[PDB]
């Protein structure tokens, strides 16, 4: 499974990923806890779901995420597998998904409607995480241009 992953990243890329991975080391053992794996995969440019992250780690329990650690050499093929699993979602696919909540005609969904979707549907996001995404997004009256919101998260 991880042994079967062939590494495609260039030598230069691998060294940069190691430097980035080590910024997450909080104890000086050159390792990160499994709970930080998602943040490092994302920092490096991938957009895996929490389900995809759990799947590469070999579906560990919620306790094993906080207690078990990982070395760069073991994380590297995981990053390759996530990168190969090409997170298919195109810009137009995301605006069509959000267009469903229009209610009105214009290209704008309401403030609390988008918050409810991100925090209660799919892979439920934390309240504080949703607030961070709304970084000056709601216009006056309390509405968000969903087309502009998709560009913002994809930036």
């Amino acid at each position: 499974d991880l042994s079967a992953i062939k590494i495609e990243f260039s030598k230069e890329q691998q060294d940069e990923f190691k430097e980035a991975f080590l910024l997450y080391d909080r104890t000086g053992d050159s390792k990160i806890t499994l709970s930080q794996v998602g943040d490092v995969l994302r920092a490096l440019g991938t957009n895996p779901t929490n389900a995809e992250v759990k799947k590469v780690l070999g579906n560990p329990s919620n306790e094993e995420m906080n207690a078990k650690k990982i070395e760069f050499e073991q994380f590297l093929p995981m990053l390759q597998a996530i990168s190969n699993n090409k997170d298919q979602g195109t810009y137009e696919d995301f605006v069509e998904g959000l267009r469903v909540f229009d209610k009105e005609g214009n290209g704008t969904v309401m403030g609390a409607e988008l918050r409810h979707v991100l925090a209660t549907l799919g892979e439920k996001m934390k309240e504080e995480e949703v607030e961070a995404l709304m970084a000056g997004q709601e216009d006056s009256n309390g509405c968000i241009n969903y087309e502009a919101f998709v560009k913002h998260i994809m930036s």
Binding site: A20, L23, G38, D39, R42, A43, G45, T46, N47, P48, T49, N50, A51, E52, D87, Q88, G89, T90, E92, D93, F94, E96, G97, L98, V100, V117, L118, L121, G122, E123, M125, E129, V130, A132, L133, V150, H152, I153, M154, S155
Partner: protein, 767 residues
């Protein structure tokens, strides 16, 4: 998806089977060549396992362990377990009588009373209240497409509403069935659905209009304890956006005869028994009556009590409906008082004067009560009955009246007061429902009196059964004629098929000139005409000349072969029933009454049946200009027993309704059609890259490109001029893919958000 059904609450197990049962059905083994239905003398059809096939016969062992042998033509293929309790019978691999019978039977056994049949819905009466009509269920059905939710009357209502906005067209919901099938209950549920979504608001008033009219127009019959004795068409008006603006009720002929006559096993209108139930003792006092119905001749000729009805609780419901509807205190009193006067009229006695045939009162005590209730002088009332005026401007020239003529006139007056009061209540309800809001479209719900066969069938039963025939023919024309023309109109390749669903033979016999009503109406204009001369004319030009007009073999005068069975009719008093004469001298007293409501009731065709035919013709014409939605009600047994199903009775109903024929046209045709603009708008989500924003492709071309880019059977759809037509089930598949794609895009948008936040945090770590 037991999580998806949690929105229905306690109703979930009654609308759709558990996810565990669905998974068990998917994994249940099945040998297609040995699992069969076999024709049975006792049960009509039974499930069985083939033991031997030889010499053109099949020996099979039934579920009950019995061994049965039939010819190969009486063996029907069984559908596999995944099709058990299927929500749309047009989706079964095999469509035949046992398959439809057993699907309805098995769904009914789990208390799932609604089932789709292609373009229409079938419902089998549970005779018990199920928790499928809660406010929580109304909420759960709002906005859902027919494929998105279990079959239900609420889904038919919502779907009709959706069609109204998308096609900018008036809709109608036509609920079919014989007496006691469930038309009134389903009509009230349609009203409940649209209303939910001191004097009350328009919503409370639409709901309350029914219990009031049911007190005065519904009665216990051998086939139904709450039989509708009048038909109604309720229009629910909506504005351009789709806001509930107004409503109106139209009622057709009320069965006036029931006010003064009842067969042995039936009652008169509920109201009489509700009043005498003594729940409101003040009403007894006000009306000058007793609590014993036997004391009133007009309303005690049959039954008096009904085990299923609490006449006390129903009086509270009637009185409460009058309050919500906003009738004045005086109007409310007048309603009860006039009802009381009707009861008293029946008890008035008359006798011949000595050496004469002329009538004269046989005591005046009863007449005194009735005149008090009507605010009339009792001596004037009795003189007008016995000595009516010949001319208008002359009170001295009067005609005599025999005792029988007076009794007949008294009956006619009591019926006229009752009927006119019933029509005035409808007028009043309509004034309350007319909010004066702007209205663009409407959804009409039709609730007629259903097909009935009694031991004695009179002119009332002929008109009721004819109305049912006309409505069955409306379903036939819509399903098997207009539907095929719709394919040709849209340019779809279609070769016409003759389904042989046409009731013109019986309809012509009844309504064509020189038909039954034409002969009856013709005989009404001859004062020398008798019941026998009418019977003779009917025989002379219809017996042996029309296959639907027969003589009864084993009393009745003629038999008609209706769509739902052969009915024996009796023509006694049809000439008298078809004319509406009143004592004009008594009418003059009502017009001068101090009781403002009675004076108002008495301040265009030559016969009653001509008016009936015109009301019927106007209704059918109106329905033609709407998009109809059919609900076919079915009684499972003839004993009001919850859960019990007599196989031959159900099969009989399925056959005469044309249920299997209707499913066949939905299987051969394209029962689902979407406008290109609406298709592109709804299903772009499935493959947004197929229709990129940069191209300025029109709605029709975008739909072609989109359907051609997804994993769908490309033979299950055809392109019309303005709409894409789908074979049954394709919309369900597109809807299922849409639900999946929208779920994935939310998690993928969340994954992007998670990525974004992790990369902004990573950017801070770098600095």
């Amino acid at each position: 998806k037991d999580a998806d059904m949690a929105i229905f609450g306690e109703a979930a197990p009654y609308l759709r089977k558990s996810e565990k049962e669905r998974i068990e059905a998917q994994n249940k083994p099945f040998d297609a060549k040995s699992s069969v239905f076999v024709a049975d003398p006792k049960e009509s059809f039974v499930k069985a396992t083939v033991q031997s096939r030889e010499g053109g016969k099949v020996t099979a062992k039934t579920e009950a362990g019995a061994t049965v042998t039939v010819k190969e033509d009486q063996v029907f293929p069984m559908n596999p377990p995944k099709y058990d309790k299927i929500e749309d019978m047009a989706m079964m691999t095999h469509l035949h009588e046992p398959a439809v019978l057993y699907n309805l039977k098995e769904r009914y056994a789990a208390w799932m009373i609604y089932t789709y049949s292609g373009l229409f819905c079938v419902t089998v009466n549970p005779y018990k209240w199920l928790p499928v009509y809660n406010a929580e269920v109304v909420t759960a059905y709002r906005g859902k497409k027919r494929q998105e939710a279990p079959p239900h009357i609420f889904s038919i209502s919502d779907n009709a509403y959706q069609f109204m906005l998308t096609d900018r067209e008036n809709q109608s919901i036509l609920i079919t069935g014989e007496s006691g099938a469930g038309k009134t209950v389903n009509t009230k549920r349609v009203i409940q659905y649209f209303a939910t979504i001191m004097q009350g608001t328009l919503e409370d008033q639409i709901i309350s209009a029914n219990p009031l009219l049911e007190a005065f127009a519904n009665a216990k019959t051998v086939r139904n304890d709450n039989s509708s004795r009048f038909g109604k068409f309720i229009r629910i008006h909506f504005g351009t956006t789709g806001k509930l603006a107004s409503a109106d009720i139209e009622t057709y002929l009320l069965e006036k005869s029931r006010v003064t006559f009842q067969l042995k096993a039936e009652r008169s209108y509920h109201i009489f028994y509700q009043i005498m139930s003594n729940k409101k003792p003040d009403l007894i006092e006000m009306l000058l009556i007793t609590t014993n119905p036997y004391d009133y001749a007009f309303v005690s000729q049959g039954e008096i009590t009904v085990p299923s009805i609490d006449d006390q609780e129903e009086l509270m419901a009637t009185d409460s409906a009058i309050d919500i509807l906003g009738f004045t205190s005086d109007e409310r009193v007048s309603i009860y008082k006039l009802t009381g006067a009707v009861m008293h009229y029946g008890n008035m006695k008359f006798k011949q004067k000595q050496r004469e045939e002329q009538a004269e009162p046989d005591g005046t005590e009863v007449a005194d009560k009735a005149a008090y209730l009507q605010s009339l002088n009792s001596x004037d009332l009795l003189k007008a009955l016995c000595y009516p005026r010949v001319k208008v401007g002359n009170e001295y020239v009067t005609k005599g009246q025999t005792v029988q003529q007076v009794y007949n006139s008294v009956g006619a007056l009591a019926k006229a007061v009752y009927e006119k009061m019933f029509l005035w209540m409808v007028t009043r309800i309509n004034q309350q429902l007319d909010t004066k809001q702007p209205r663009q479209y409407f959804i009409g719900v039709l609730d007629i009196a259903g097909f009935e066969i009694f031991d004695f069938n009179s002119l009332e039963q002929l008109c009721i059964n004819f109305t049912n025939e006309k409505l069955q023919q409306f379903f036939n024309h819509h399903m098997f004629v207009l539907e095929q023309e719709e394919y040709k109109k849209e340019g779809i390749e279609w070769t016409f098929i003759d389904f042989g669903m046409d009731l013109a033979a019986c309809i012509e016999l009844i309504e064509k000139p020189m038909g039954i009503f034409s002969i009856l109406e013709e005989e009404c204009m001859f004062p020398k005409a008798t019941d026998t001369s009418f019977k003779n004319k009917l025989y002379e030009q219809h017996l042996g000349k029309s296959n639907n007009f027969q003589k009864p073999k084993p009393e009745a005068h003629f038999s008609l072969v209706h769509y739902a069975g052969t009915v024996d009719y009796n023509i006694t008093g049809w000439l008298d029933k078809n004319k509406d004469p009143l004592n004009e001298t008594v009418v003059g007293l009502y017009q001068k009454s101090a009781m403002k409501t009675l004076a108002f009731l008495f301040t265009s065709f030559q016969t009653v049946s001509a008016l009936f035919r015109e009301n019927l013709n106007k209704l059918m014409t109106n329905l033609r200009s709407t998009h109809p939605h059919f609900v076919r009600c079915i009684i499972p047994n003839e004993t009001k027993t919850p859960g019990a199903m007599e196989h031959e009775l159900v099969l009989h109903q399925l056959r005469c309704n044309g249920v299997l024929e209707g499913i066949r046209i939905c299987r051969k045709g394209f029962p689902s059609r979407i406008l290109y603009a609406d298709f592109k708008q709804r299903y772009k989500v499935l493959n947004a890259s197929a229709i990129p924003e940069g191209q300025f492709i029109d709605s029709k071309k975008a739909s072609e490109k989109l359907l051609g880019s997804i994993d769908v059977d490309h033979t299950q759809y055809k392109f019309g001029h303005t709409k894409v037509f789908f074979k049954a089930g394709l919309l369900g598949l597109l809807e299922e893919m849409r639900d999946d794609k929208l779920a994935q895009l939310i998690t993928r948008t969340q994954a992007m958000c998670r990525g974004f936040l992790a990369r902004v945090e990573y950017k801070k770590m770098v600095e």
